[PDB]
């Protein structure tokens, strides 16, 4: 909408897409089951066009020579997200265990607990306590 704000009318698009929705759900009056599916889906098309753009997410070089860049919020939202495994303190144990699965998977490139049956077990206990943070669990793994 903020692309076509100069050429097209923003008010003409909302009234066109609403009656595009209303005439399409009038075609689905017979099945009685998919009409509420497309009413959920056309309402995404109306409500996403209601808002304006979000801003561009921007990376910054903390080194002075590495250049800063920019990325559209669209382009990050379309690609899949890497599963960020945050570990907080009092979470449950199975949800605690797949974090320390993935911490080995990040550093040692594969799950060497599952595949080689080895990994230092005293460090996980300080990790699962909430004693050391996840920054420290990487660093004491890196000096091992």
């Amino acid at each position: 909408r903020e692309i076509i704000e100069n050429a097209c009318s923003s008010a003409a698009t909302l009234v066109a897409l609403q009656e595009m929705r209303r005439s399409a759900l009038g075609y689905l009056q017979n099945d009685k089951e998919g009409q509420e599916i497309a009413l959920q889906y056309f309402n995404v098309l109306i409500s996403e066009f209601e808002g304006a753009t979000p801003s561009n997410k921007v990376r910054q070089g903390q080194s002075v020579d590495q250049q800063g860049l920019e990325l559209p919020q669209i382009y990050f939202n379309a690609a899949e997200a890497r599963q960020k495994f945050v570990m907080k303190s009092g979470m449950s144990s199975s949800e605690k265990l797949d974090v320390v699965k993935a911490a080995y998977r990040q550093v040692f490139e594969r799950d060497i607990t599952r595949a080689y049956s080895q990994g230092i077990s005293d460090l996980e206990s300080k990790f699962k306590n909430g004693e050391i943070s996840t920054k420290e669990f990487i660093r004491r793994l890196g000096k091992s």
């Binding site: 903020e2 704000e5 304006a52 753009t53 979000p54 801003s55």
Partner: protein, 160 residues
């Protein structure tokens, strides 16, 4: 200002500021009384500016005053007239500091999406600052018009 560009630039490289920026610090600090010719002539001529630009906006784009718009009620229009002099306040922070560091961290970081949290759209409010520039630069003298013109010009790029 220039001094917080240098200390935050010399802390992570763990070194004293060298002469390439110490000459750059001292060159800003001899231009205060030149910059103070610009900062009060914006100050006492504030209310002459604040509705000469506000009439300039709605004669250019009347939809914020049109019924169903944004400042169609008076409690929104009293808010929106306030935000001009708020923007005239923080621009004059920048001309005093001679840099971006007040004009970043007060009224510019994150405004592209938090007008969208409100009702006000983005690019009409870009037109509000652009008419506020010519409402101020006509009041300014010409040889110091070109100094204060990039500080108004940054707000056009960062908001759109």
């Amino acid at each position: 200002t220039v001094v917080s560009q240098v200390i935050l630039k010399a802390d992570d490289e763990l070194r004293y500021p060298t002469t390439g920026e110490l000459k750059n610090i001292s060159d800003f600090l001899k231009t205060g009384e030149q910059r103070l010719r610009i900062v009060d002539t914006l100050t006492e001529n504030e209310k002459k500016i604040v509705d000469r630009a506000s009439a300039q906006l709605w004669k250019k784009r009347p939809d914020f005053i049109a019924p169903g718009g944004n400042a169609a009620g008076q409690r929104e229009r009293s808010l929106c007239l306030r935000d001009y002099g708020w923007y005239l306040r923080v621009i004059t922070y920048g001309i005093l500091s001679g840099d971006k560091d007040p004009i970043e961290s007060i009224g510019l970081i994150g405004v592209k999406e938090m007008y969208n949290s409100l009702g006000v759209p983005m690019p009409g409010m870009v037109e509000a600052i652009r008419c506020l520039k010519e409402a101020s630069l006509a009041l300014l003298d010409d040889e110091d018009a070109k100094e204060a013109a990039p500080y108004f010009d940054f707000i056009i790029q960062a908001m759109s």
